[PDB]
């Protein structure tokens, strides 16, 4: 699963609490896309547990913006990466 887009100060802790409030406690690991040069978050994350997050998580507002959740594929990573640098 991929989630985003959100601001660069949206934390892994904030993202986790929003995931628990829909009923996903089976999260293994969060990994943010980051600028490697300076460590800045690119505003999206790969979440690793699925269909609970695809369904109930979108339509939630995190630090102002609405989250788009979609399944982890190459197709969906290019869309979030293209969206990242459209900012």
């Amino acid at each position: 699963v991929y989630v985003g887009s959100f601001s660069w100060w949206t934390t892994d802790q904030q993202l986790i609490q929003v995931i628990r409030s829909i009923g996903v406690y089976d999260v293994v690991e969060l990994k943010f896309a980051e600028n490697r040069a300076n460590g800045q978050s690119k505003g999206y994350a790969e979440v690793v547990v699925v269909h609970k997050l695809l369904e109930l998580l979108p339509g939630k507002v995190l630090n102002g913006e609405k989250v788009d959740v979609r399944p982890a594929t190459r197709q969906n990573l290019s869309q979030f990466e293209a969206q990242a640098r459209k900012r």
Binding site: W8, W9, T10, T11, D12, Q13, K31, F32, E34, R36, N38, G39, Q40, S41
Partner: protein
Amino acid sequence: NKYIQQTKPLTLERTINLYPLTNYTFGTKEPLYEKDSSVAARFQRMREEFDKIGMRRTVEGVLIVHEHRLPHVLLLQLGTTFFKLPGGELNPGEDEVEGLKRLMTEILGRQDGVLQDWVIDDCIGNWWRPNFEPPQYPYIPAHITKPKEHKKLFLVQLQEKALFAVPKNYKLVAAPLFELYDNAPGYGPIISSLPQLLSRFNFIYN
């Protein structure tokens, strides 16, 4: 019995005595091998340990000498282009400074009975590793609440003369600050920023 001395004036201006490179010598001891020699092994252990004890705490020492009135930083060379500062991992709950004293004695401590005395009064900087990957930064990225490694650097003041014992698979070398400066490709981001980190110190070239 002794006379009561006047206070040494309290200032955050730091004055540091340096001594000539040729005041420092070394003998050889048995080779040293780090816990991990491969990248993949490094990060596997870091993951495993992170689950048990949490954030890795590393401490490293910056030992400074001079030649031609230019400070030189002592480095451990393990390969043509592979350098590290003396240091390593703290045990659980171990004090940062006493831990760095242990690590330094393990790596460089003289083997002929005379106890090495490390003077460690100055923190030079901090680097954080946000993930189980190579990048480290001099700050914690705003989205990271749980960094995987915290590395702290300290200036270790040397006595006028010292004998070290160097593991035989290492070389101990003295890098002029101009060799490190803007040379991240050769020395990495931590060592190459030592000129900047040391610039605040008032060095006395004895």
